[PDB]
Amino acid sequence: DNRIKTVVILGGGTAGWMTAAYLGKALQNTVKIVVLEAPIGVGEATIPNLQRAFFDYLGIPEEEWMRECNASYKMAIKFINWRTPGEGSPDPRTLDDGHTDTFHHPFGLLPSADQIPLSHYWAAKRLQGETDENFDEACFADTAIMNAKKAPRFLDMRRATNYAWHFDASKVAAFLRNFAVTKQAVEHVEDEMTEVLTDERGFITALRTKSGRILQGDLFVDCSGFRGLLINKAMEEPFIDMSDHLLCNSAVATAVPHDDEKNGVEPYTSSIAMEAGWTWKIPMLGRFGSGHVYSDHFATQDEATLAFSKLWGLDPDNTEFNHVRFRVGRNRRAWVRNCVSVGLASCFVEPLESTGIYFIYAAIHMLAKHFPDKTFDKVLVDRFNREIEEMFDDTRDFLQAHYYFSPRVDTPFWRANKELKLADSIKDKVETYRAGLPVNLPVTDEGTYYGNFEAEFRNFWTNSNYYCIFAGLGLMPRNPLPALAYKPQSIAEAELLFADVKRKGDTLVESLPSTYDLLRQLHGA
Amino acid sequence: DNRIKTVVILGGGTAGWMTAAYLGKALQNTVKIVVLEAPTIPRIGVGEATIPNLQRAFFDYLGIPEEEWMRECNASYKMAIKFINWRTPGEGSPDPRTLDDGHTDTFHHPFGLLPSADQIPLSHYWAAKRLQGETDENFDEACFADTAIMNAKKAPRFLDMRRATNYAWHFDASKVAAFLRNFAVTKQAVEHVEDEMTEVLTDERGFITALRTKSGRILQGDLFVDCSGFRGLLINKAMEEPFIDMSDHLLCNSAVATAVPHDDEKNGVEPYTSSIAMEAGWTWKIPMLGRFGSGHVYSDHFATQDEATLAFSKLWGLDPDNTEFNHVRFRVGRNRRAWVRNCVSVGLASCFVEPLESTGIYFIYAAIHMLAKHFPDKTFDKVLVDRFNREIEEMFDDTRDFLQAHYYFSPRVDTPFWRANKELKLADSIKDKVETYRAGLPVNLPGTYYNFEAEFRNFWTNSNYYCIFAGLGLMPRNPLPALAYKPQSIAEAELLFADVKRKGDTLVESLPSTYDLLRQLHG
């Protein structure tokens, strides 16, 4: 009998309790699970597969967890002032053509005509001077719905659009801890780790605690955060610093009480460009989480905190600030011997595409797939490690493109981004885009894509996502897709799709409830 | 207008007329299409087998109903390739030898989907029981109802044409090509020039400008498709693009083939292609109504043409002195680049492997799909050409690796040919997949599938690797370790195994014979 009998998780929070609850379901009461954890809600934003890939697996209905963590609805990230110079403002500046400096990255699907995405018909007309319309307004009904602050469901809870979630991550962690301890008999040891015991092979045998426990385990999950107390400190696995691709390394954050009555609730996360980074806005009922992500090479903590405060008119003497220094990059290997890293202990990028929670449940999914026995088959470990490195580096490259293709040159920070190098993989995608070709076509429709883990994991950033960011920032193809010059019938079919987007936006803006009204009903306010 | 105005296709057959008909639809009457094809006499119809996306990816695109084209090329139904005697020594026989465990030396590679329990494919629950000594049942019988249907020679549709299973097609490829020629010329205004090419005219940049014909007509064009076959008259001869010989991965380079009249009444019709292992290669059997195509694929380093023809003839009891044979020398491999300047190669002019997994027609329509996606203007953007070439090389090399695994993992060591296969090297990509398989992990986890991009990007999936590896006796080193923690999931999989048996039992009882469905289809 070579089975793992005990799994010890170091750390709580979202990483530790997502790991505990998921393995609690996956291992069907065959394995003892222990969490060792020493005893302000700035908001977290997510992507649409969180319910299908995580909560549905645990059998937790969406409304149940949402009501425990002041959750709200997200249809997109809205990028504000990424193309125009100046100080941080929550209000969009005006471009040369009179448009507000805003662009959306929605979760809505792009339809195709003749197997060519609607993006490419839009780009052909834009390049040929035949449309004045922005990509997001042309191609997604979601853009109209967001502009109206309408909800992605009706009051009868019928779905209207794709969406994900805003929530208090501390409340999600507390909710999952309660679930794991009360419904899955996970053992919660509330104590400080004082020593990692290892054998002659460098495998972890046990964690010593301050109170004198020696917690034996066969498999150790490092959820200890940026310090990597098992994977980095005990296992001596090097961390690969990737600040040569992304310069931001710090955040200052708070939660801001909000006049939902007067302002409604935006069904999207905002990414507000700053002089030395950007600021999130993550609406929830009664308040929005907000954090200024910055490079401490280009702003001091005090300078960033002052800029963040000025943005929202905060009184710095009645505001609780939370300050973090990030580690940006990933370990050389996520799993070494009998130590698997998950969450910040494994890897991190700034929350610019709301990938943090996704990286936790993707890692947990890959651990359950590659779950070992005590022989620690090197092929299982290697395949898990390859999946984590590919997932991470692909998202790192995608985030670098947000900065690299910004036209801003107004501050040392915005210029400094354009002196960095792109990795070969994203250079290849930019060249493909610049020739008018799609980048990573989607393989399926919405249901299959957000309802099968492998489908989204293998095609995570697709053509729609590349167009939203490249075209949003003003990077266009050199010329239209040449095939379109031969396809007058397909161009006509695409005109019907553009008209469908307009009619659907008109219809749903008229018929949907406000996000505020859907939230008041969900939370029983 | 910097558009291509004329496309000239050199060569007919499946490659030339599939290209003409597909571009006829894709280019919406904006481009003149010309096929230059010499008059030829079809060699005997040695039969072609296909994969299931041919109707959705190709005929449905042209608006041609399945039954209409099937009725024009004596088409029959294919639920799998059935591999015979790939594990046991001796002479070519159509009859399976007996393994050590008493089972016939047969295994199926069907198109049926593998269900999953707890996101783990049924293959992995079968492998766990097999390795733990809890089943003696073969993978194909345990995991696909299709195996029972094929063993009974039952059809994949009912006589009311309701679908029971996934399937593809057997047909006379010359008749399909003639059907598509008629369609292209009569419905899409493609010009058929029936003449021989005498010269390829090029400019100083190495672009083709025109093909001279024997009649003296000069066919001007802006884009040229090489469908000329193994001679590669445009891509290899005129453009001097080098061919990469891949006989360091696959040794077979020759075929001897014929068509055998068949007593369908007495024998029924098998709804599958057979792959019959030989001493120096293998022999296809491709049933159609009233006859089956058959060809012995061989290495002429291990068998002379005479030796191969004798062995092939002995297989079916043909008189080697009184039988009409087609003798072919293959080119195995691909061009360094499929598309050079304004010359795109399609079919045998582009690349070739032996028909061991029925991929030849797939390679044609995948190439045509990729050309329509990457369709150029007269600037011939090097990025469009490069991306097309990358797709062809990855498509080809992936299937080359998959075919090499059929030989590399055969346990046979009884002839110099079977031993010689094991001295060849596997490419890193297939070595990696075998390593993944050997750890008990899925390899490439998979209606939607048979969407072009979905199948093109995930062509050989976990079920395909299990069919071949487990068929040949290559097993994981151990079960998927996760299964040791999942008693509820193992129980769920028992219900799937029961469902396979119940569906096989039910459909073997209720389905018509392949023979009876064929008699109804062909009037």
Q: How wide is the angle at C-alpha A164 spanned by C-alphas A159 and A166, nearest 5°? A: 125
Token digits of residue A31: 């394995």
Q: CB–CB of A368 and B482 under 8 A? A: yes
Nearest to B377 among A372, A437, A482 (CB): A482
Beta bridge partners of B7: B33, B223
- The number of beta carbons lying within 10 Å of the beta carbon of residue B382 is 11
Cβ neighbours of residue A304 closer than 8 Å, sequence gap 6 or more: A250, A252, A276, A277, A292, A294, A296
Beta bridge partners of B255: B297, B328
Token digits of residue B34: 């010309």
Token digits of residue B174: 């010359």
Nearest to B375 among A4, A115, A483 (CB): A483
User: What's the helix, strand, coil split of chain A in %, to 5?
Assistant: 40, 20, 40
For residue B500, the SS3 value is helix
- From the list A23, A12, A487, A78, the residue with the least C-alpha distance to A273 is A78
Q: Amino acid identity, residue A323?
A: H
Asked whether the beta carbons of B417 and B303 are under 8 A apart, the reply is yes
Side-chain-side CA neighbours of B281 within 13 Å: the count stands at 29
d(CA B521, CA B167): 15
Chain B residues within 8 A of A448 when measuring between CB atoms: 448
Side-chain-side CA neighbours of A220 within 13 Å: the count stands at 28
Q: CB–CB of B435 and A379 under 8 A? A: yes
Residue B189 φ/ψ region, left for φ over 0, alpha for ψ in the -120 to 50 degree band, beta for the rest: left
Nearest to B376 among A373, A434, A482 (CB): A482
Q: Are strands B168-171 and A347-348 parallel, antiparallel or unpaired?
A: unpaired
Q: Amino acid identity, residue A404?
A: Y
User: Which sign does the torsion angle of CA B40, B43, B47, B49 carry?
Assistant: negative
Q: Rounded to whole angstroms, what are the CA distances from A64 to A23, A40, A51, A522? A: 21, 22, 11, 10
Q: Are strands B208-213 and B197-202 parallel, antiparallel or unpaired?
A: antiparallel
d(CA B7, CA A464): 32
For residue B302, the SS3 value is coil
Q: CB–CB of B439 and A28 under 8 A? A: no
Q: How wide is the angle at C-alpha A396 spanned by C-alphas A394 and A399, nearest 5°? A: 110
Q: CB–CB of B441 and A370 under 8 A? A: yes
d(CA B271, CA B114): 20
Asked whether the beta carbons of B369 and B362 are under 8 A apart, the reply is no
Token digits of residue A358: 């996704």
Phi, psi of A165 (to 5 degrees): -135, 145
Chain A residues within 8 A of B117 when measuring between CB atoms: none
Please tell me which residue of chain A has the smallest CA distance to B478: A377
User: Which sign does the torsion angle of CA A259, A262, A265, A269 carry?
Assistant: negative
Which uninterrupted H or E stretch holds B77?
strand B76-78
Asked whether the beta carbons of B334 and B243 are under 8 A apart, the reply is yes
Q: Are strands A193-198 and A76-80 parallel, antiparallel or unpaired?
A: unpaired
Q: How wide is the angle at C-alpha B49 spanned by C-alphas B44 and B51, nearest 5°? A: 160
Q: Are strands A219-222 and A339-341 parallel, antiparallel or unpaired?
A: parallel
> What is the strand order of the sheet B48-49 is part of?
B48-49, B168-171, B76-78
Chain B residues within 8 A of A453 when measuring between CB atoms: 119
- From the list B78, B72, B115, the residue with the least C-alpha distance to B493 is B115
Phi, psi of B203 (to 5 degrees): -90, -175
Q: How many residues would you count in chain A?
A: 525
d(CA B82, CA B84): 6
> Active-site residue among B32, B78, B187, B501?
B78
Three-state secondary structure along B256-300? EEEEEECCHHHHCCCCCEEEEECCCEEEEEEEECCEEEEEEEECC
For residue A482, give how far its alpha carbon lies from the nearest alpha carbon of chain B (Å).
Answer: 6
Asked whether the beta carbons of B268 and B349 are under 8 A apart, the reply is no
Chain B residues within 8 A of A493 when measuring between CB atoms: none
The distance of Cα B512 from the centroid of its chain, to the nearest Å, equals 26
Q: Amino acid identity, residue A96?
A: D
Burial class (CB in 10 A: 0-12, 13-18, 19+), B98: exposed
Q: Amino acid identity, residue A337?
A: R
Phi, psi of A8 (to 5 degrees): -110, 120
Q: CB–CB of A380 and B481 under 8 A? A: yes
Beta bridge partners of A240: A330
d(CA A367, CA A386): 12
> Active-site residue among A25, A74, A183, A427?
A74
End-to-end CA distance of chain B: 50
Q: Rounded to whole angstroms, what are the CA distances from B312 to A241, B254, B308? A: 64, 13, 6
- From the list B175, B462, B229, the residue with the least C-alpha distance to B351 is B229
Q: Rounded to whole angstroms, what are the CA distances from A290 to A252, A255, A478, B440? A: 9, 6, 37, 46
> Residues of B324-358 as b/e, b for ≥16 C-beta within 10 angstroms?
ebeeeebbbbbbebbbbbbbbbbbbbbbbbbbbbb
Cβ neighbours of residue B59 closer than 8 Å, sequence gap 6 or more: B65, B66, B69
Cβ neighbours of residue A101 closer than 8 Å, sequence gap 6 or more: A80, A81, A82, A83, A84, A92, A93, A94, A95
- The number of beta carbons lying within 10 Å of the beta carbon of residue A87 is 12
Q: What is the C-alpha R_g of chain B? A: 23
For residue B85, the SS3 value is coil
d(CA B458, CA A116): 20
Chain B residues within 8 A of A371 when measuring between CB atoms: 481-482, 485
The distance of Cα B29 from the centroid of its chain, to the nearest Å, equals 31
For residue A276, give how far its alpha carbon lies from the nearest alpha carbon of chain B (Å).
Answer: 36
Nearest to A489 among B28, B31, B486 (CB): B28
Q: How wide is the angle at C-alpha A426 spanned by C-alphas A422 and A428, nearest 5°? A: 110
Asked whether the beta carbons of B352 and B252 are under 8 A apart, the reply is no
Q: Amino acid identity, residue A313?
A: G
Nearest to A486 among B28, B384, B486 (CB): B28
Query: Which of B223, B342, B428, B485 would best serve as a mutation to test chain A binding (most A beta carbons within 10 A)?
Result: B485
Asked whether the beta carbons of B409 and B472 are under 8 A apart, the reply is yes
Q: A-B interface: how many C-beta pairs under 8 angstroms? A: 102
Side-chain-side CA neighbours of A74 within 13 Å: the count stands at 30
- From the list B235, B226, B251, B240, the residue with the least C-alpha distance to B332 is B251
Asked whether the beta carbons of A285 and A518 are under 8 A apart, the reply is no
Beta bridge partners of A271: A79, A280
Asked whether the beta carbons of B120 and B440 are under 8 A apart, the reply is no
Three-state secondary structure along A493-514? HHHHHHHHHHHHHHHHHHHCCE
Q: CB–CB of A490 and B28 under 8 A? A: yes
Asked whether the beta carbons of A19 and A341 are under 8 A apart, the reply is no
User: Which sign does the torsion angle of CA A338, A339, A342, A347 carry?
Assistant: negative
Beta bridge partners of A335: A340
Q: Rounded to whole angstroms, what are the CA distances from B28 to B25, B33, B229, B385? A: 6, 11, 27, 22
User: What's the helix, strand, coil split of chain B in %, to 5?
Assistant: 40, 20, 40
Q: CB–CB of A431 and B383 under 8 A? A: yes
Token digits of residue B136: 């003696």
Chain B residues bordering chain A (beta-carbon distance below 8 Å): 3-4, 26-28, 30-31, 119, 372-377, 381, 383-384, 387, 435-436, 438-439, 441, 445, 448, 451-454, 457-458, 478, 481-482, 484-489
Query: Which of A443, A457, A458, A459 would best serve as a mutation to test chain B binding (most B beta carbons within 10 A)?
Result: A443
Is B32 assigned a catalytic role? no
- The number of beta carbons lying within 10 Å of the beta carbon of residue B195 is 18
Please tell me which residue of chain A has the smallest CA distance to B438: A379
d(CA B123, CA B117): 11
d(CA B195, CA A8): 77
Instruction: Match 């054998």 to its residue by tokens.
Output: A199
d(CA B175, CA A258): 73
Cβ neighbours of residue A134 closer than 8 Å, sequence gap 6 or more: A99, A103
Pinpoint the alpha helices (H) of B327-415.
360-373, 382-408
Q: CB–CB of B448 and A448 under 8 A? A: yes
Breaks (C-N over 2.5 A) in chain A follow: 39
For residue B117, the SS3 value is strand
d(CA B354, CA B347): 13
d(CA B237, CA B233): 5
Q: How many residues would you count in chain B?
A: 523
Which uninterrupted H or E stretch holds B240?
none
For residue B250, the SS3 value is coil
For residue A237, give how far its alpha carbon lies from the nearest alpha carbon of chain B (Å).
Answer: 24
Asked whether the beta carbons of B120 and A454 are under 8 A apart, the reply is no
| Residue ranges of domains in chain B | 1-523
Residue A43 φ/ψ region, left for φ over 0, alpha for ψ in the -120 to 50 degree band, beta for the rest: left
- DSSP type of residue B234: I
Q: CB–CB of A444 and B438 under 8 A? A: no
Phi, psi of A463 (to 5 degrees): -50, -45
Q: CB–CB of B383 and A435 under 8 A? A: yes
d(CA A394, CA A7): 30
Asked whether the beta carbons of A252 and A304 are under 8 A apart, the reply is yes
Query: Which of A2, A23, A115 would best serve as a mutation to test chain B binding (most B beta carbons within 10 A)?
Result: A115
Q: CB–CB of B485 and A31 under 8 A? A: yes
Q: Following DSSP, what letter does each residue of A290-324 receive, concatenated?
A: EEEEE-TTTS-HHHHHHHHHHHHT--TTS---EEE
Nearest to A444 among B381, B454, B484 (CB): B454
For residue B19, the SS3 value is helix
Q: CB–CB of B486 and A373 under 8 A? A: no
Side-chain-side CA neighbours of B217 within 13 Å: the count stands at 12
Q: Rounded to whole angstroms, what are the CA distances from B196 to A362, B11, B41? A: 59, 10, 14
- From the list A243, A254, A256, A301, the residue with the least C-alpha distance to A276 is A301
Q: CB–CB of A454 and B435 under 8 A? A: no
Nearest to A435 among B381, B452, B482 (CB): B381
d(CA B513, CA B271): 9
- From the list B511, B505, B513, B512, the residue with the least C-alpha distance to B141 is B505
d(CA B138, CA B106): 10
- DSSP type of residue A485: G
Phi, psi of A510 (to 5 degrees): -70, -45
Chain B residues within 8 A of A380 when measuring between CB atoms: 439, 441, 481
d(CA B94, CA B392): 35
For residue A190, the SS3 value is coil
Chain A residues within 8 A of B458 when measuring between CB atoms: 443
- The number of beta carbons lying within 10 Å of the beta carbon of residue A111 is 16
Nearest to B28 among A370, A434, A487 (CB): A487
Instruction: Match 């202990």 to its residue by tokens.
Output: A345
Q: Rounded to whole angstroms, what are the CA distances from A203 to A265, A308, A376, A479? A: 50, 45, 10, 56
Token digits of residue B330: 């293959």
Q: CB–CB of B486 and A27 under 8 A? A: yes
d(CA A186, CA B143): 37
